[PDB]
From a paper:
In this work, we have explored the function of coiled-coil- and C2 domain-containing protein B (CC2D1B), a poorly characterized member of the Lgd/CC2D1 family of proteins that also includes the closely related human CC2D1A and its D. melanogaster ortholog Lgd. These proteins are characterized by the presence of four tandem DM14 domains that interact with the CHMP4 family of ESCRT-III proteins (Martinelli et al., 2012, Troost et al., 2012, Usami et al., 2012) and one C-terminal C2 domain that mediates their binding to membrane lipids (Drusenheimer et al., 2015, Gallagher and Knoblich, 2006). Therefore, we reveal CC2D1B as an essential regulatory factor that licenses the formation of ESCRT-III polymers to ensure the orderly reformation of the NE.
We then explored functional determinants shared by the Lgd/CC2D1 family, thereby performing structural studies of the highly conserved C-terminal region of the Drosophila ortholog Lgd. The structure revealed an α-helical N-terminal domain that contains a ∼50 Å long helical hairpin, followed by a long coil structure arranged anti-parallel to the hairpin which connects to the C2 domain at amino acid 664. The C2 fold ends at amino acid 796 and the remaining C-terminal region (residues 797–815) intertwines with the N-terminal helical domain, thereby stabilizing it. The C2 domain of Lgd forms a classical β-sandwich structure with two four-stranded β sheets that classifies as a class II C2 domain with N and C termini oriented at the bottom of the sandwich and opposite to the top loops, similar to the topology of the phospholipase C-δ1 C2 domain (Essen et al., 1996). The Lgd C2 domain is atypical as two short α helices are inserted into the loops connecting β strands 5 with 6 (α3) and β- 7 with 8 (η2). These α helices are conserved in human CC2D1A/B orthologs, suggesting that these regions are functionally important. The convex part of the C2 domain is rigidly connected to the N-terminal α-helical domain via multiple interactions. Interestingly, this cluster is conserved in Lgd (residues R689, K701, K703) as well as in eukaryotic orthologs including human CC2D1B, which is consistent with the ability of CC2D1A and CC2D1B to associate with membrane pellets in cell fractioning experiments (Drusenheimer et al., 2015).
Author numbering: 575 to 816
């Protein structure tokens, strides 16, 4: 749009608003899917469907040359403050789930453990580690660690915006033998600004250089960092007439 063309810009914002609403539908749908909640899942998929229809209607009016569709505001109940109720408002949880086929020299008794480093106030702190699984290239750690955050501190918001959690995978050197760094995994925290968990599997790295196997990890909060402004969107749900 030309910067003086206000009706054009309204049209752009209509589409942006609906695209943001679509994103919220899919995210929430995906949270309910991950939690074995079939009914919430279909619910927010159906909400996504209606948002997409309106998105298509607006794009179509623009593809031809018709007036923008009339619209109005409604509300939608997302329950953003209450996904992962198992967690305090102040709590971030890290789950080291499993290693997958580390590229080591041993088959069995490769013995492994994972160190976790989570940045805290005035860089940094919080460090911990998993137990030592024994005798497998594909370990099944299943350990959860909780830490305290301050959503209020703008430098904690810094950390979620820009920074991440470091996972170091170590082989347990035996008698008079030190431990070997098998590989590193670094997971950015910023998806937690609008989502309430990260869950993926990541390649063990050396540099700059993929090592071999993978590590599967979860990072979970009670609600997204930017829950407050997500709620504002849900209070003015843009919906086309009719």
């Amino acid at each position: 749009c030309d910067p003086t063309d206000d009706i054009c810009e309204i049209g752009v914002r209509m589409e942006e608003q609906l695209a943001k609403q679509l994103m919220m539908c899919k995210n929430t749908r995906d949270h309910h899917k991950a939690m074995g909640d079939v009914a919430g899942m279909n619910r927010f998929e159906n909400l996504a469907l209606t948002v997409q229809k309106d998105l298509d209607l607006v794009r179509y009016s623009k593809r031809k040359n018709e007036p923008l569709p009339k619209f109005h505001y409604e509300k939608r109940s997302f329950n953003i403050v209450h996904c992962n109720t198992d967690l305090t408002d102040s709590e971030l949880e890290i789950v080291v789930v499993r290693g997958i086929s580390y590229n080591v020299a041993n088959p069995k008794d490769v013995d492994t453990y994972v160190r976790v480093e989570f940045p805290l106030l005035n860089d940094e702190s919080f460090k911990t580690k998993t137990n030592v699984i024994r005798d497998t290239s594909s370990p099944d750690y299943d350990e959860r660690f909780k830490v305290d955050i301050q959503r209020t501190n703008r430098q904690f918001q810094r950390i979620f915006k820009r920074h991440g959690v470091k996972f170091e995978i170590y082989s347990r050197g035996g008698f008079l033998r030190s431990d070997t760094l098998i590989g590193t995994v670094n997971v950015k925290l910023q998806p937690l600004e609008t989502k309430c968990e990260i869950h993926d599997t990541y390649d063990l790295m050396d540099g700059r250089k993929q090592v071999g196997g993978k590590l599967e990890v979860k990072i979970r909060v009670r609600n997204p960092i930017l829950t407050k402004q997500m709620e504002h969107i849900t209070e003015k749900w843009l919906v086309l007439d009719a």
